[PDB]
Design a protein around this ligand. Structure first.
Ligand SMILES: Cc1ncc(COP(=O)(O)O)c(CNCC(=O)O)c1O
Ligand SMILES: Cc1ncc(COP(=O)(O)O)c(CNCC(=O)O)c1O
Ligand SMILES: Cc1ncc(COP(=O)(O)O)c(CNCC(=O)O)c1O
Ligand SMILES: [Ca+2]
Ligand SMILES: [Ca+2]
Ligand SMILES: [Ca+2]
Ligand SMILES: [Ca+2]
Ligand SMILES: [Ca+2]
Ligand SMILES: [Ca+2]
Ligand SMILES: [Cl-]
Ligand SMILES: [Cl-]
Ligand SMILES: [Cl-]
Ligand SMILES: [Cl-]
Ligand SMILES: [Cl-]
Ligand SMILES: [Cl-]
Lengths: 344, 343, 343, 343
């Protein structure tokens, strides 16, 4: 088989999950009658210190229903220049909510509070209303970097003074929590809503969850219906979600250790990586000192049994997760070492 | 509890539960889930189309179809009492920026002539009619079957005008079972068809959209945008395969149970028209009862029967896999006792 | 050419041309155009409203109103043959992302009970009904006057449910002249009204929206987004002030001409209903002619008479300031000759 | 009041007022306004394009162009500080459902390589890059002129990828007078161009979009949808024709006044860069003043000079036909007095 370092989304269900899904107690969620979904949402709200939660088929929908519930047509959403909502969500914010993204550069996912402040639009007929500020914790593009709690706190203070909503794209908020030691409820305390994925490092086959106030979640639920996320006996999926949330968080530390090990060794080989920047499950490798670009290196890697994604023409992203063991990492490293000789 | 609210409440068969537990999966975003791929392969084959796309719900199936078939500002001709127009949260306006052009119909069948008259002529003031939608086994009219000839004639009109045709076939198999018309035959007269796996076919989640390759490619991107792009969705697809391949024939049982239920309810004295029961739905009027539909629904629940009121004077009863003949007979004994109380 | 196509073809009076040439202007984006400001003050005053907004067209007038009254996904109740649904290029769906909810009407008058029944109940499957629109002097039906009683009732219903009411008053003055109902009284039963200056009132460009200060503020911003935020628009407002203050009374002349036209056409043998002609429009059916509406329209054009077909069997004739009684007589001689050829 | 806020405040010349009063008009919706038709013919010819469209504002000109070049979910590459992104009410997201893709630029000139990298790869997660917009005489950077070579290289990239190119030429004639490059040459490297008549050219209302026949047809329909479809707009076009054919040359006077203003402000001690002033705009920084941009604008107003702050430390000064050398000289006396007070 292949050593899959493309993403943590490829994680497969554990034995415990397969069993729980196949024997899930279910109901029609449209009627709010699926017991497993209801327990998953109750558990999620509780974990994040929020009043309510909403299960969704993907993180993308989690983000989009949140944007829909937080905005009105013609509004502007302040977000990080390299955030997922801006680059990888098919421009849904424009089509679905009719809102404009207001890109603010960030240092490792951390937008400077004063830059966010300046990004807020003055009340002028020429300008749309800034109604939402979005923050991504463990910013993907920058290498799964951890946004400091103080950063989020400061932005919350600015949002409050202006009456602006705050949404945290916490797709990998648990990785951030494991790395920082900050409980997720703390990050959530400085936001109106938080979306987090169950289908990545937590290993569930499908789904993400949005948490927030009752009225917000009710609005998000209606948005979910409109977008087509209103499923029937979704308890089959939620069963795995419950296990992800309750038993797969602590072991994320193993993915971080594997990623750091990978980074340190890649550095020793001579690759352009920064082990000092690796705090969660991602490693960015630049092909600057290689005689091939990102795409060419990805092909050579595939040809040698290693799978990864090019994130630019000069950068590759390596992601660790439950289905890549330390031994798998060592195997990949031995291959990376030989390839270094070939392309250096 | 005897649940006659809708066929959406069907639960997974033992066969499905086993298949879900041992389902082979992969990341669908990369098109690497083997079970999802097989489900879509089977669905396309079944409806005689080039491709298929699995979606979380029928609503998304309809919406990605509309998006893939239209451009902002277009108009969509659809039946005045269709699900897309009534129960899809106005998604077509928000997601596709298109306007509905309601055409009345007789039990889901729009007069072909009225369809032709609803097509907008080319003029700067008018939107472009780019899609015509037909719902088979029309929900609101009481689960009626739209004649194949009606669909055939509308298709001809569409072709002559270069307009796409979408069949909302959430319950197209019920239509096929009742009419004897194969689903491929219905499909042949349409550009795309959405059908549900999560209703009478008993899958826990999902529907499927079938059509040409280019159409499906556009719909797949629309699905990503809407949030329907899942990961190891093979677990759901495993139940979906069983639903598509082995749960169709038994739909005849739901039809029989519905008719039997209607005939007996009429015998008791309830205001029902057994002659109108074509598929798995029975409409019950409450005009002769001491309490309206909402009050009667509560009496029913207290006695162990679940049903929905669709108006102050109407209740809809829906049969499905999880409503056996025994359950029907038990429900009738309850209806009998309640008639003595509320007539 | 005797132009009976629409009252939009009206050309500026000498008084207007002079007023435009000497118009005092400023930058409207800064709210500094004094002539625009006066036009809006006068418009608000005339309709008994708090504020007013000048727009480049009636279509923008209706659309900024819809945007200001609704949110994405909302539903808008409107008459089945209203201009907003048929002649505004599906703008409501694209610009506001809203769903139209057509309701049948008798010459523009929707039965109040049907409106009440069109209001969506609070359910996750349904959009929220946030607006009801009424067109006074309903175009399609032949410039018919909607009864004030009808408007009052719908207003009462709207209040109960907290729904906004917008009156498409493109020809509200024609309705007032014929009914004897002051435009301020019509306006009192609505949250917003759009009326045109560019039709019967003869201004070359523009309409105005009137309503509450906050609503107008939202409409103004919508106007900026749509591209209606002009600069020295006082040039157009000068003609607008004259249209609003000096051209209302003479509308009776267009009505007289329209009625006379209809009476004579009936005597010739054409399918018209002189008794239904109360303002400046005449609907002419072609069911008793050798050619349909499109064929008859071309014949009329070749003979010097311009009109538009509103369907395959109906032609709309409209009178206005640029059509004198003499022009009507000449037209009648032409219609007389064409009846011999096509009856 | 000496108005240096913008060139939008320009008022009609006597020649224009007379032309508007004597304007030959018609109903534009039927394409029958002779003056609008000639303005569009002239605009098209002037820019070396086959068609043109008159619009109520530059904002609508840009937006109908975006609508006609894109499909829902598309992405539009544009300069980070461009008007379309910052000053058009987020209209591109609402009207066309498209995403802006900001690219840094040096005085309006995006590096061609950056543009190349901003184009989205074909992937399900990414919107399709279907349009690249370029603003000539980039407003925010001080009315800077984008080099013809920059537009030429971007055009090559666009062609290579089958992507449309739109030039926001609101002040493209200022660019042409300063650079010596004919507007038809800039436009030769674009698919469409929008230019304003209501700014430095002194028309009271409007802009014009030029491009291919089909594109313009789509833009015309978009205009109808947005509410820009006017009637006897010839009154406005009459002034537009004069603006286009007689007000271009004198733009050099505005540039001369801007330069003179910059040189004297520098001489006084203000933070300005005369070397950066190539058209009708001067950027003044408040860095060496005991007050911020907002406080300074207030001081200028109390002394009789109007200007706009574009940031907390920068104010924009704009020259035009209604700010003569005398006014500049008078303004300088005020600036001199204020410098003593705030330095
Ligand atoms: C920060 C972030 N946010 C939102 C999403 C969307 O979730 P879905 O894929 O479930 O829609 C992703 C997925 N990112 C894919 C990856 O990093 O490989 C993500 O990384
Ligand atoms: C009732 C009504 N409402 C709104 C509009 C739109 O106004 P503009 O044409 O200025 O956009 C019209 C024009 N109707 C076309 C006609 O009767 O000739 C109309 O008749
Ligand atoms: C480059 C540019 N583009 C488009 C527009 C929009 O045109 P309208 O204002 O006619 O909609 C403006 C106006 N700019 C105002 C100013 O700079 O003072 C502009 O400067
Ligand atoms: Ca997974
Ligand atoms: Ca090893
Ligand atoms: Ca089911
Ligand atoms: Ca007119
Ligand atoms: Ca001007
Ligand atoms: Ca002098
Ligand atoms: Cl169960
Ligand atoms: Cl909204
Ligand atoms: Cl597997
Ligand atoms: Cl589109
Ligand atoms: Cl003036
Ligand atoms: Cl004229």
């Amino acid at each position: 088989m292949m050593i899959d370092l493309r993403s943590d989304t490829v994680t497969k269900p554990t034995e415990e999950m397969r069993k729980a899904m196949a024997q899930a107690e279910v109901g029609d969620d449209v009627y709010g009658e699926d017991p497993t979904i209801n327990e998953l949402e109750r558990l999620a709200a509780e974990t994040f210190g929020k009043e309510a939660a909403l299960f969704v088929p993907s993180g993308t929908m989690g983000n989009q229903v949140s944007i829909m519930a937080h905005t009105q047509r013609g509004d502007e959403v302040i977000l990080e220049a390299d955030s997922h909502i801006f680059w990888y969500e098919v421009g849904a914010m424009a089509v679905l909510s009719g809102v404009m993204p207001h890109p603010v550069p960030g240092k490792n996912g951390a937008m400077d509070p004063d830059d966010v402040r300046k990004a807020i639009r003055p009340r002028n007929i020429h300008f749309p209303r800034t109604s939402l500020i979005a923050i991504e914790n463990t910013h993907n593009r920058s290498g799964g970097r951890v946004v400091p709690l103080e950063n989020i706190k400061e932005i919350c203070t600015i949002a409050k003074e202006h009456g602006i909503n705050v949404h945290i794209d916490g797709a990998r908020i648990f990785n951030a929590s494991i790395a920082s030691g900050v409980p997720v409820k703390e990050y959530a305390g400085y936001a109106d809503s938080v979306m987090f994925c169950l289908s990545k490092g937590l290993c569930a086959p499908v789904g993400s969850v949005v948490v927030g106030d009752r009225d917000f979640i009710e609005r998000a639920r209606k948005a979910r219906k409109m977008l087509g996320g209103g499923m029937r006996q979704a308890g089959v999926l939620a069963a795995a979600g419950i296990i992800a949330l309750t038993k797969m968080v602590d072991r994320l530390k193993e993915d971080h250790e594997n990623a750091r090990f990978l980074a340190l060794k890649l550095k020793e080989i001579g690759y352009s990586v920064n082990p000092e920047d690796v705090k969660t499950n991602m490693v960015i490798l630049r092909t600057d000192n290689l005689k091939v670009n990102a795409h060419g290196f990805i092909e050579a890697l595939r040809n040698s049994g290693v799978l990864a994604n090019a994130v630019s023409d000069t950068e590759i992203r390596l992601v660790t997760h439950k289905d890549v063991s330390r031994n798998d990492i060592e195997e990949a490293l031995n291959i990376f070492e030989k390839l270094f000789r070939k392309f250096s």
